[PDB]
Amino acid sequence: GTILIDLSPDDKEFQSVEEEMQSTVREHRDGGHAGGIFNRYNILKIQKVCNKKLWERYTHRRKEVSEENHNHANERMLFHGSPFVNAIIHKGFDERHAYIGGMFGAGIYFAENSSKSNQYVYGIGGGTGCPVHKDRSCYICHRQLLFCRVTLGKSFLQFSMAHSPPGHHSVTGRPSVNGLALAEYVIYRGEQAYPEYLITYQIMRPE
């Protein structure tokens, strides 16, 4: 049931999605080991992901969360990187997209920094890098991220599939050492995210 609509680079929506991609690149403590060395991306395509069943699954859970949290879904747009982008856009998020070994337990992880999600496109820790050249810093091969609508509801704040902490709908990983890092977020039900944009890109070699 999924269809992908290409956005024009002239479309304000393409432009606002690209700006969130580009403006949330940071340097990483691994010096580029997992995700490569880059300060910016070459955006090749941005597609809107349209699936009625999946959307209605999302908005149903969103209303449940909202009614449990004084009519506040606490909805964010966040990045997700994974080698299973194609399963996600067609069948939705579920337990098979959980990061079992993540620092907040087995849940589905999202990032405010696009460059954080970029580290997971080829696997945990970047895996063995691109399938073609086995390079985690490949500047040639096309990568994909999701920019997703995520319902956080009442989020458990951690300074730093399973269930959410009692009385909470998600976990927030607040950075407490690296002053430049943005937050990461974990949900424990696939229905609390909808994969709204598929972004196809390359990382760009710094000059």
Ligand X SMILES: Nc1cccc2c1CC=NC2=O
CA angle 87, 90, 92 (to 5 degrees): 80
**96 SS3 class:** helix
User: Considering all CA atoms of the chain, what is the largest pairwise distance in Å, rounded to the nearest integer?
Assistant: 51
How far apart are the C-alpha atoms of 26 and 38, rounded to whole Å? Answer: 9
133 is in an annotated binding site: yes
From 18, 184, 191, 196, residue interacting with ligand X (rule: CB under 6 A): 184
How far apart are the C-alpha atoms of 142 and 119, rounded to whole Å? Answer: 14
Stretch that binds ligand X, among 74-82, 125-133, 162-170, 192-200 (CB under 6 A): 74-82
Distance of CA 14 to the CA centre of its chain: 17
Q: Pick from 78, 101, 93, 69: which is nearest to 169 by CA?
A: 69
Strand partners, 79: 111, 147
x-marked contacts with Zn ion along 129-148 as a string, rule CB under 5 A: -x-xx----x-xx-------
148 is in an annotated binding site: no
Sign of CA dihedral 205, 82, 113, 45: positive
From 80, 143, 149, 169, residue interacting with ligand X (rule: CB under 6 A): 80
Residue 52, classified by CB atoms within 10 Å of its CB into exposed (0-12), middle (13-18) or buried (19+), is exposed
Among positions 105-164, residues that touch ligand X (CB under 6 A) are 109-111, 116-117, 120
172 binds ligand X (CB under 6 A): no
138 binds, among ligand X, Zn ion, none (CB under 5 to 8 A by kind): Zn ion
Stretch that binds ligand X, among 38-46, 60-68, 80-88, 130-138 (CB under 6 A): 80-88
177 binds Zn ion (CB under 5 A): no
**84 SS3 class:** coil
50 is in an annotated binding site: no
From 83, 102, 123, 165, residue interacting with ligand X (rule: CB under 6 A): 102
133 binds, among ligand X, Zn ion, none (CB under 5 to 8 A by kind): Zn ion
Which residues make up each annotated binding site? 130, 133, 138, 141
**Interface with ligand X (CB under 6 A):** 79-82, 99, 102, 109-111, 116-117, 120, 184
**Interface with Zn ion (CB under 5 A):** 130, 132-133, 138, 140-141
